[PDB]
Design a protein around this ligand. Structure first.
Ligand SMILES: [Mg+2]
Ligand SMILES: [Zn+2]
Lengths: 49, 586, 1340
DNA sequence: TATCCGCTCACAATGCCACACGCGCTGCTCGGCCG
DNA sequence: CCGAGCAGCGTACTTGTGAGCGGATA
């Protein structure tokens, strides 16, 4: 009941609550609107770093 | 962990599955396909679609909320994820920490117990045996009867005679916790000493129900046990019924007597002008009770009696003075219940609801609380006894109809007829016609109600060394209404006299009242208008209980964030209290 | 004349108004609805022919292949209703439809089709209702409540108050079809009109109008008027009409024809209008500032350059006026604007429209319809014409068109089921007028706008919902199926037709099992009107305006009957005389009142026709020959009571009961109690439970003779005759010769139902009420069903009741009952619980019902039979094995030799798991019946063989009675045949002819008649044998149970529950309560004669809860007993029949001007004795709901006996033995035991099982579960102290799995100390939050 | 460019109890598979 | 046997309140 496990993801995935919390935290942390973040995450556009 | 998503093998082809496991399987499938795809050097579009599917599965299992797309069988709402399992009315923060199920409890209907004291309540035999199994087990292990726990279980299931005294021992001073289904304030949960009663229902003290607002139309109350020395002593100290007499909102006692006892005491105190034993003399309350039990004198008769009243001085002294009063036999008999603290003028009245309420208030303020509970218990006992011995009963002839009621109705009809004639002639309009008929009908209703009221407080005459002497009406319905037991003035007014004006679907007043009363046959359209007006009033309660519950919820949400911890701060700021004299006088 | 059931015990009635229309069939609503469903209806009307002529035929994608329809027929019921309830199958019938497939070759626009295939196919089965209007789906008998929704058509709502917080009234016109998409024209706080479809985005109506082949010019000339501004030589003249200038002040000099009329600043009044009209003037002198404020209607393109200069919907300016004057356009068409006559709403709506042509309008509207997917003008117009102009997504039925035409002042009443452009034009005109002030808004709380739908309509709707799917399937199948493929059999499919109808009848918010606990409950459950469900308002999102009752519900909807709780006013009961209209409305019978006489003719008025006429009152005092006793009478013109004369009256009420429902009409003295108490009693009288011996109600309402008969609980005589064979289980009726069938007739056999389980676990049983030789009439009652007495509804029991406080045992609502009631077996009922155990087909071997249960005591096995099922009539108290269910767990292929050896020698059966079902703990009772059903192919056990042999023997007894009757008839015939040879007959045919039909002499006629009779005999024998074999094959065939099961075993436990302190009982006037305790007879009060009162109530609850009628009832009850008492004093002491007849006549001839007027001289002086025997226990008195008896009638009835006039008798205390002063009233009251007895409420749990997902105790009584500690209880605890108490109640006793064990161990040895520990659920949330990215960590 | 206003979206609605009944994108086809 | 594509078609609006995102005119 208390012991847990872990899934090793080969691709790191960002949390959903930091995107659709209205407002989002990453949206205010990156100074970027939620639309650009959603279009980048869902594999439609790129963004420089 | 798998325990929080259990998969028990259900009987038959049907299986008890958890939905989170489907999302887990989906995300594991997508993760495995991603791990296998990136090793064969797949091009960009396939691995990108795979990563997109993995991210979609992740953001779906974390929370199942979309714009308008929801996958589910027939509930018209999608499957609950862990986030949805945390939120909602059925979520963790509302279903598994706020309200939880507790064991060692019971639920049964309530029944009136008039013999039990205020500090105790009834409890069924089977419920008592079920709610105290380990106490009986431990007491049997303490004695040389039950060797093992299985032996004690076989004994208590065998239902022999040597287990009943053990129950009486373990329920001698072990208070239980009674609870009403809706708990508006703290009084919805109290503590009571249980007494074994034979049957299958929970016997409750009659007076304490007012604290729960629990009628006896089939209310199902719950019962719990402390099961802890600390909890037992707490229930005996604070949550006990005797320790809670004053309402948390107002300093007025929640121990106000009910309708039966106040009716009995009003009958015992209401005196006529001529009866058996009129104008005689007695030497004390005990001799008066003996004279009443022998039947030589009536219950109520103006008799000069001698009593001894105790008055409290500035210190804790109680000076006794013997005085000859001129009161009725009922008050002198009831004086045996009043302790020495209260004076005699507190009972030299008709003892209405407010009268006995202020009597209990003064008794608690003067003598404290220790004798106040016994005083109230004896009040209820004597009230029930003398109400049973009286024989109060409402009949079809007890409600007198005014003689000139028909004449008043005819006058109002002639007035409305001439008003309608003036309206048809073109002198007055329709709005002024309505405004002039409403007040006419209101005045007629007021006149007929005053006539009925003065006709109810009369007709009770009897020869008292003379020919005719008017006195307080001994009528049953008047004794029930004027005493404030159950009926009010408006209720008896609309019952005996005309009901008056009614409402309309818009909410305003219809220009035609109900010229009939309950004692007479109501026309079908009159009853239709009345039930139309009453259905709204009935539905308000059902549509308001949930709003009041939600309001109480919000109020306790904003509240319960503080406790008193400091004795004094050393400030001087405050508010300037003044009586509210705005509008009217005060 | 009086029926024979009335001659057995005639009920004394009251009232002075004689009824004119008899009480109709109580179940006529659902019966008529179902009869209008399954029947050959021409012209494709309601039922099934609508779905056959509105859907069929079907054509492929121009494939020249059509599927026609000819007719449909209902198959015979595959099972009897009794066998249906037994086996749990659906009481349904097949649907054999003769379809016609016509297919032709390609390249034929209208080529003559060939190879017609007319084939009958079976497409699904339809459930049928019995003669009681109940559908037996799966064992239980469910019903369909008639829903109440909004009638299809238009409505004009007035939104105000909290609408946009603007304080401006808004008018919205909602067009709602019968089946399709909605439409709504709405307004804003501004002057802008908009349109919307199914609560979509707000769009102007100009674009949705232009999409229907319209232009701006047509818009303005259809909506607005025409204003003419001409370009004369000068002054820009303009045509004047004296009616338009009303309300507007003259901004210039109103003068013309060289005669001044109005100055500048003076309004034109009606007298000025007449003065200007008497001159007949049109043209005046108007300045430029007047036209410079108007707006040009149409586009005025130039002719010199060919370019538009002044576009539409543009106010005229200096440049525009100069251009229109210099171009050469003299005629100027402008629109009119006046906020009091025609408010500007088309100009602004046109100028806000972004589109200008029909094409782009469709594109924008489609972009609104579905986001994205822009069509190249292909899907836009098609979707727009399919959502509102196609019969595929718009099924506005005849009632919709009727409401549409009636609302718009249209003279016609019919039309098409499709919308139209001019209809939208008219409804928008009506909205504009209702905004300007012309008209009134249509309220939604009016029965004229609220239409009811019965079971037939929703059944047809679900049939169509399945038929559209079968049509899609058959179209996708025929879309490529060429000529000569197959017969039209596999082209159709059973699913989802059967699936849809089964899910509709079984699983819906309205298809519900009916409460089989009271005949009155049954009558009031079928005559129910619901507003929830499909197309209904939810109970959690409703307003206070729908819960209230409208004055239009007079005689149509009962206002005093509604369930108390969340759904108040939403669930109503139908009136007694109420009927459904053709369109679906509610009509009420009335009497047509002529100028002088009130003709006794019935007219069914509708809700819309209410305000048209005026209705007289029911209890209006009238003289003979139809004349009112007073000129000034009370009536109602238009939903409002008033006073009219004896000439303005046009219609009269039919009876005084048409307002009250059938449920509340059984409450006597209903005109003497408040609406609240009567409403509470109406919901309680429905929840009555029948006792062992039902007692007739003394204070009846006359309706008891109907509810008991109109229901399906009483065996009604279909054909009158003489009762030949009486039996506690069956009744045989010999049909009289007058109504007997002229060929191949016999006798009727009514098989009563014994103690069987009902839907509420209430013992339902039928008992006979006639004996041998007693002649019965057609329609008369034959056997009393549950809660009935001699063809009369007997819900509860009458008892002696007093009204006095008794030591507080009647404190607030509690009742005190004497021990006499529990001693006399009065309020004891029977509860029949059904326990079912199924032998599912599991892996590792199937499950068995063997009896060799291992690891169990022999005393536990002693109750089972040789098969493994307990015997019939065995008592069980605690959890005991009553079925031998075992489940294999280990090795399979158990050899039969070793299998039987295990029961003799060696080891036991290990692979069992002891899965045998037992009764729950606490519940007791005696098993009375067993029910077993097997899967097809599985061999039955011996108990199934026994029960099928029992039912086969019952059928054998019935068929043998029939056979012996017919055989005795045929042998009397053969005696009459060979009677010519009488000597040989009497000598060698007395004893042996019953088996020696073989005879012959004088062949010429004797042989012919003998061979004909032998033919008849052999044919009769063969037919009886065939019927017997069919019955046996029907009762012996296996039944499908479930996928993966062997057999199901059902048992019935019938426990007799008596009255005890804790049960809930109530009268019939809302005086409910709980029984306080049982007192002995010596402790209860008693009169001076020595008769102790059985029940004493609280006389304090009468004044506040104003129900005085019951008191009246009580008094009346006393009077009744008095008569009975006298009858007893006339029966115990042997008295001549003359004195008895005289007394009965004096009783029935009470001076109250009653319409009864019975005569005792017409009786046979023998039935009078039976009647007096039936009256010795009381005199059943009937009183109307509003024509009831006055006080003087009860006074004189009491005077008839030796009872006191006041009704109050001095009572002596049982305990002390003294006299109670203030004489208490005492009488007879009819009371009921509610279905809330204590035996299903009291429950307690010390330690039981815990839930698997959370370590918390269980809940409920069926399982061993404790109560729940609510959050408000936590608040109450926090209000007090009790930190340790709350920690114990919440953590150790509830959640801590390691704490409750330690606490139990500390309690079982005397250690009162707990440990807080850590809550598992707290740790559960701790884990989940830790598992989430938002983790946590405990600190020091 | 600000700022009152309108359009769009998210969140609420049993507070408790008892009893009873019952399942709405999967079906079909083509790349990859360790006790 | 498992995972990805192929396919006909497959997947709350009642009223009230608070918050965010434009949005149109000075
Ligand atoms: Mg209650
Ligand atoms: Zn302070």
């Amino acid at each position: 009941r208390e012991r847990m496990g872990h899934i090793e993801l080969a691709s790191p995935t960002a949390h959903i609550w930091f995107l659709k919390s209205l407002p989002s935290r990453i949206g205010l942390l990156l100074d970027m609107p939620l639309r650009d973040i959603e279009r980048v995450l869902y594999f439609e556009s790129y963004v420089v770093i | 962990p798998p325990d929080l998503r259990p998969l028990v093998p259900l009987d038959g082809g049907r299986f008890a599955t958890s939905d989170l496991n489907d999302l887990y399987r989906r995300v594991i499938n997508r993760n495995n396909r991603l791990k296998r795809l990136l090793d064969l050097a797949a091009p960009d579009i396939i691995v990108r679609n795979e990563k997109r599917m993995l991210q979609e599965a992740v953001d779906a299992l974390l929370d199942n909320g979309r714009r308008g797309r929801a996958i589910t069988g027939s509930n018209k709402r999608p499957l609950k994820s862990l986030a949805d399992m945390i939120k909602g009315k059925q979520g963790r923060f509302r279903q598994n920490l706020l309200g939880k199920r507790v064991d060692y409890s019971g639920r049964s209907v309530i029944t009136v117990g008039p013999y039990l004291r205020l500090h105790q309540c009834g409890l069924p035999k089977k419920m008592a045996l079920e709610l105290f199994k380990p106490f009986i087990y431990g007491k049997l292990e303490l004695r040389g009867l039950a060797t093992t726990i299985k032996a004690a279980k076989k004994m208590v299931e065998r239902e022999e005679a040597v287990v009943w005294d053990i129950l009486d021992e373990v329920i001698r001073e072990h208070p239980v916790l009674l609870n009403r289904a809706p708990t508006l304030h703290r009084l919805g949960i109290q503590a009571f000493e249980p007494v074994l009663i034979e049957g299958k229902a929970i016997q409750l003290h009659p007076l304490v129900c007012a604290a729960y607002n629990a009628d006896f139309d089939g209310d199902q109350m719950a019962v719990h046990v402390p099961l802890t020395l600390e909890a037992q002593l707490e229930a005996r100290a604070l949550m006990m019924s005797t320790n809670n007499i004053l309402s948390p909102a107002n300093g007025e006692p929640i121990i106000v007597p009910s309708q039966d006892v106040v009716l009995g005491l009003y009958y015992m105190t209401r005196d006529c002008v001529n009866a058996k034993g009129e104008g005689m003399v007695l030497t004390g309350p005990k001799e008066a009770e003996r004279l009443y039990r022998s039947g030589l004198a009536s219950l109520h008769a103006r008799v000069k009696v001698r009593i001894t009243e105790y008055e409290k001085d500035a210190n804790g002294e109680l000076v006794a003075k013997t005085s000859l009063k001129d009161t009725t036999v009922g008050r002198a008999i009831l004086w045996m219940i009043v302790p020495k603290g209260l004076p005699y003028s507190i009972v030299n009245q008709a003892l209405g609801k407010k009268a006995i309420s202020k009597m209990l208030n003064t008794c608690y303020r003067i003598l404290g609380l220790k004798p106040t509970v016994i005083f109230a218990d004896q009040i209820m006992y004597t009230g029930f006894a003398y109400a049973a011995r009286s024989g109060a009963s409402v009949g079809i002839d007890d409600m007198v109809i005014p003689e000139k009621k028909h004449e008043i109705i005819s006058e109002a009809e002639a007035e409305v007829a001439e008003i309608q004639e003036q309206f048809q002639s073109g002198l007055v309009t329709a709005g002024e016609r309505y405004n002039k008929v409403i007040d006419i009908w209101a005045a007629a209703n007021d006149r007929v109600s005053k006539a009925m009221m003065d006709n109810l407080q009369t007709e009770t005459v009897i020869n008292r060394d003379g020919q005719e002497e008017k006195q307080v009406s001994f009528n049953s319905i008047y004794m029930m209404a004027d005493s404030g037991a159950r009926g009010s003035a408006a209720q008896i007014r609309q019952l005996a006299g005309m009901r008056g004006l009614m409402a309309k679907p818009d909410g305003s007043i219809i220009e035609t009242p109900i010229t009939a009363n309950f004692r007479e046959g109501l026309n079908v359209l009159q009853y239709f208008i009345s039930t139309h007006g009453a259905r709204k009033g009935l539905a308000d309660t059902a549509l308001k209980t949930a709003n009041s519950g939600y309001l109480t919820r919000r109020l306790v949400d904003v509240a319960q964030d503080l406790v008193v911890t400091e004795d004094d701060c050393g400030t001087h700021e405050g508010i300037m209290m003044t009586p509210v004299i705005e509008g009217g006088d005060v | 004349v009086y029926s024979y059931t009335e001659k057995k015990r005639i009920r004394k009635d009251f009232g002075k108004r004689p009824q004119v229309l008899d009480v109709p069939y109580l179940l006529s609503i659902q019966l008529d609805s179902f009869q209008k469903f399954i029947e050959q209806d021409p012209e494709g009307q309601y039922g099934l022919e609508a779905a056959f002529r509105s859907v069929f035929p079907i054509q492929s994608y121009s494939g020249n292949s059509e599927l026609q329809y000819v007719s449909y027929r209902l198959g015979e019921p595959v099972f009897d209703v009794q066998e249906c309830q037994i086996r749990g199958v659906t009481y349904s019938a097949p649907l054999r439809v003769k379809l016609r497939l016509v297919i032709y070759e390609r390249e034929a626009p209208e080529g003559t089709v060939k190879d017609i295939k007319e084939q009958e196919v079976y497409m699904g089965e339809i459930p049928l209702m019995t003669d009681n209007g109940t559908f037996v789906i799966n064992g239980t008998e469910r019903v369909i409540v008639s829903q109440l929704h909004r009638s299809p058509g238009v409505f004009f709502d007035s939104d105000k108050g909290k609408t946009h917080s603007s304080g401006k009234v808004l008018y919205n016109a909602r067009i709602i079809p019968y089946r399709g998409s909605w439409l709504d024209f709405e307004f804003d706080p501004k002057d802008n009109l908009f349109v919307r479809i199914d609560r979509r985005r707000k769009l102007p109506a100009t674009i949705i109008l232009r999409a229907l082949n319209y232009t701006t010019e047509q818009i303005l000339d259809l909506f607005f008027e025409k204003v003419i501004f001409e370009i004369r030589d000068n002054k820009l003249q303009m045509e004047l009409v004296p009616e338009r200038l009303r309300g507007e002040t003259a901004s210039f000099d109103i003068e013309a024809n060289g005669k001044v009329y109005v100055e500048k600043g003076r309004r034109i009044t009606a007298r000025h209008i007449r003065q200007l009209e008497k001159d007949d003037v049109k043209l005046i002198e108007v300045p430029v500032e007047y036209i410079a404020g108007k707006v040009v209607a149409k586009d005025y393109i130039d002719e010199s350059t060919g370019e538009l200069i002044c576009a539409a919907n543009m106010e005229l300016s200096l440049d525009l006026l100069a251009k229109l004057s210099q171009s050469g356009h003299k005629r100027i068409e402008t629109l009119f604007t006046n906020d009091l006559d025609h408010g500007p709403y088309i100009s602004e709506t046109l100028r806000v429209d972004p589109t200008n042509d029909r094409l782009s309008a469709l594109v924008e509207i489609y972009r609104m319809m579905r986001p994205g997917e822009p069509p190249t003008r292909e899907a836009a117009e098609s979707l727009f014409e399919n959502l509102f102009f196609s019969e595929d997504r718009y099924d506005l039925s005849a009632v919709g068109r009727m409401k549409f035409n009636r609302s718009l002042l249209r003279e016609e009443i019919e039309g098409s089921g499709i919308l139209s452009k001019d209809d939208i034009i008219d409804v928008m005109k009506k909205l504009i007028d209702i905004r300007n002030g012309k008209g009134e808004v249509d309220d939604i709380d009016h029965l004229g706008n609220r239409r009811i739908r019965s079971v037939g309509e929703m059944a047809e709707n679900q049939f169509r919902v399945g038929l559209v799917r079968v049509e899609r399937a058959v179209k996708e199948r025929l879309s490529l199926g060429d000529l000569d493929t197959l017969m039209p059999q596999d082209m159709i499919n059973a699913k989802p037709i059967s699936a849809a109808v089964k899910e509709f009848f079984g699983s819906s918010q309205l298809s519900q099992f009916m409460d089989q606990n009271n005949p009155l409950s049954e009558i009031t459950h079928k005559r129910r009107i619901s507003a929830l469900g499909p197309g209904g308002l939810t109970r959690e999102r409703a307003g206070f305006e729908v819960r209230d009752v409208h004055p239009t519900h007079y005689g149509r909807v009962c206002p005093i009957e509604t369930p108390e709780g969340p759904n108040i006013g939403l669930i109503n009961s139908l009136s007694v005389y109420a009927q459904t209209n053709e369109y679906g409305f509610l009509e009420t019978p009335y009497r047509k009142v002529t100028d002088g006489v009130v003709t006794d003719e019935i007219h069914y008025l509708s809700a819309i026709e209410e305000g048209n006429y005026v209705i007289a009152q029911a209890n209006s005092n009238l003289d003979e020959e139809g004349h009112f006793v007073e000129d000034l009478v009370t009536c109602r013109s238009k939903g409002e009571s008033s006073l009219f004369s004896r000439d303005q009256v046009d219609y009269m009420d039919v009876s005084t009961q048409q307002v009250v429902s059938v449920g509340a009409s059984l409450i006597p003295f209903l005109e003497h109690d408040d609406a609240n108490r009567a409403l509470m009693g109406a919901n309680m009288q429905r929840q009555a439970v029948p006792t062992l011996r039902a007692d007739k109600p003394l204070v009846g309402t006359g309706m008891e003779r109907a509810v008991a008969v109109d229901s399906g609980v009483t065996a009604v005589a279909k054909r009158g005759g003489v009762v030949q064979y009486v039996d506690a289980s069956r009744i045989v009726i010999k049909v009289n010769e007058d109504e007997m069938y002229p060929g191949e007739a016999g006798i009727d056999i009514y098989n009563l139902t014994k103690y069987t389980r009902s839907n509420q676990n209430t013992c339902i049983n039928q008992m006979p009420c006639v004996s041998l030789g007693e002649p019965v009439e057609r329609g008369d009652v034959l056997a009393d069903g549950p809660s009935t007495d001699l063809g009369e509804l007997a819900l509860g029991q009458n008892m002696r009741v007093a009204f006095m406080p008794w030591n507080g045992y009647n404190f607030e609502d509690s009742i005190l009952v004497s021990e006499r009631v529990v001693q006399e077996d009065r309020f004891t009922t029977i509860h029949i619980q059904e326990l079912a155990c199924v032998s599912r087909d599991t892996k590792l071997g199937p499950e068995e019902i063997t009896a060799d249960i291992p690891n169990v005591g022999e005393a536990a096995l002693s109750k089972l039979d040789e098969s493994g099922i307990v015997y019939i009539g065995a008592e069980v108290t605690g959890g005991d094995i009553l079925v031998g269910k075992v489940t294999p767990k280990g090795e399979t292929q158990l050899t039969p030799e070793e299998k039987l050896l295990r029961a003799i020698f060696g080891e036991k059966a290990s692979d069992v798991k002891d899965s045998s079902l037992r009764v729950p703990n606490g519940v007791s009772g005696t098993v009375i019946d067993v029910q077993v059903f097997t899967r097809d192919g599985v061999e039955k056990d011996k108990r199934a063989l026994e029960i099928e042999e029992m039912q086969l023997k019952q059928a054998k007894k019935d068929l043998s009675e029939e056979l012996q009757i017919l055989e005795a008839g045929l042998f009397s015939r053969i005696r009459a045949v060979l009677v010519a040879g009488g000597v040989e007959a009497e000598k060698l045919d007395k004893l042996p002819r019953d088996r020696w039909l073989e005879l012959g002499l004088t062949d010429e006629e004797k042989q012919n008649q003998l061979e004909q009779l032998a033919e008849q005999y052999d044919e009769l024998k063969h037919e009886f044998e065939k019927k017997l074999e069919a019955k046996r094959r029907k009762i012996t065939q296996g039944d499908d149970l479930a996928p993966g099961v062997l057999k199901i075993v059902k048992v019935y436990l019938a426990v007799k529950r008596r009255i005890q302190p804790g049960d809930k009982m109530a009268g019939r006037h809302g005086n409910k309560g709980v029984i306080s305790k049982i007192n002995p007879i010596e402790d209860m009060p008693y009169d001076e004669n020595g008769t102790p009162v059985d029940i004493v109530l609280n006389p304090l609850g009468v004044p506040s809860r104003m129900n005085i009628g019951q008191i009246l009832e009580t008094h009346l009850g006393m009077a009744a007993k008095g008569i009975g008492d006298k009858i007893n004093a006339m029966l115990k002491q042997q008295q001549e029949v003359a004195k008895l007849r005289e007394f009965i006549q004096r009783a029935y001839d009470l001076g109250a001007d009653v319409r009864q007027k019975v005569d005792l001289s017409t009786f046979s002086d023998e039935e009078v004795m039976r009647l007096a025997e039936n009256l010795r226990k009381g005199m059943p008195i009937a009183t109307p709901v509003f024509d009831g008896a006055k006080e003087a009638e009860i006074k004189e009835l009491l005077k008839l006996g030796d009872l006191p006039t006041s009704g109050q008798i001095r009572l002596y205390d049982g305990r002390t033995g003294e006299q109670f002063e203030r004489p208490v009233t005492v009488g007879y009251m009819y009371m009921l035991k509610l279905n809330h007895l204590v035996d299903d409420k009291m429950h307690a749990r010390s330690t039981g099982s815990y839930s698997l997902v959370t370590q918390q105790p269980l809940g409920g009584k069926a399982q061993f579960g404790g109560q729940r500690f609510g959050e408000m209880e936590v608040w109450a605890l926090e209000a007090y102290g009790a930190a340790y108490t709350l920690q114990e109640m919440l953590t150790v006793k509830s959640d801590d799995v390691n704490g409750r064990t330690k606490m139990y161990k500390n309690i079982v040895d005397g250690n009162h100390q707990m440990e807080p520990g850590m809550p598992e659920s707290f740790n559960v949330l701790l884990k989940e939050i830790r598992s989430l990215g938002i983790n946590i960590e405990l600190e020091d």
